[PDB]
Amino acid sequence: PQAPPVLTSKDKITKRMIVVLAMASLETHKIYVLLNCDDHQGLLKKMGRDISEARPDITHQCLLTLLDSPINKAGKLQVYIQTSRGILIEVNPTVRIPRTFKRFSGLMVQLLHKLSIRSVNSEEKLLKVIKNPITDHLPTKCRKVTLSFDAPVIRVQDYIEKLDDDESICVFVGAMARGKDNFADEYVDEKVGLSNYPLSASVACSKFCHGAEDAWNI
Template identity: 65%
Template sequence: MAATSGGFQPRERRFSVQEQDWDPAPPKRPRLGAGSKCGGRRLIVVLEGASLETVKVGKTYELLNCDKHKSMLLKNGRDPGEVRPDITHQSLLMLMDSPLNRAGLLQVYIHTQKNVLIEVNPQTRIPRTFDRFCGLMVQLLHKLSVRAADGPQKLLKVKLVKPLGGFWGRFWG
């Protein structure tokens, strides 16, 4: 008998009648839809104090960033350390990829430093690269909503653009 390279020979697997009739276990994560027993309970996450602000550079608008616009921030007397849209980007990536969101139990809102409240649809796929994320946020802040490319569904929409009062004033003062 010739030796095989690597020294590993897989065995033949023989199935018995019991193994062929075996049903796989149900998924560990519950599938929650319209008729779920959770009663519509969801975790609401608000990214408070997000630094999402547009600035005009030449003829185009860009998302204000501490790396690209440091001289502009220092000229206006603002701390570059407070203008960090990359933190919002990373937080959104982690939240939208979480098992809780995939199960349909997460609702994400973004509240910016300029009192803009943004609702994020749970089906939204956040761009992986920071530059594309910046372009998406500039589009959102100027058009007040971002629709899906393949349908009328709104993926991101601005809810409030005024000083918060009333119901929301209790949470953010």
């Protein structure tokens, strides 16, 4: 099938992997920039903020990792973003995330201000701010789990293979530098670890994609 239909929140049925990048650090400031600890340390200090929390680069790298993956190219992946200010974003699987941080910031600034980004020539949304909670958008049958260092370690393939034939898997991954992995406790009934080492979010995203790709023969 050279053309798998693009997965969106409107399909409640198709079995897929969903990744939610939670506590994402995406905040605009008119100086419009995305605030970040590399460029805006003095400012963040003056705002009384923990400098280390301003990490939009984490969300940027997780997006590049997830959207480049074989599972995305196979049409079996969705990504949502929950920012630390409570904004929910649905990412269209076909969207092109710029490699440079500068252009990613420009894109996110437009998204946060206009509330969507339309498809260039064709005219449907490539990124859209949507109403909370995430659970109004996920497939009807969908296992929900948080990835955490503090949790028992699983092999992704084992985990994925034990899903029912119609059951999606939604994984919540912290898009932050630090903090408790409690960001999705309202949504999940299970937490799993993927390694005996603390990982970056991009690595944890990558491990989970690889195990799904393997299990699903992608």
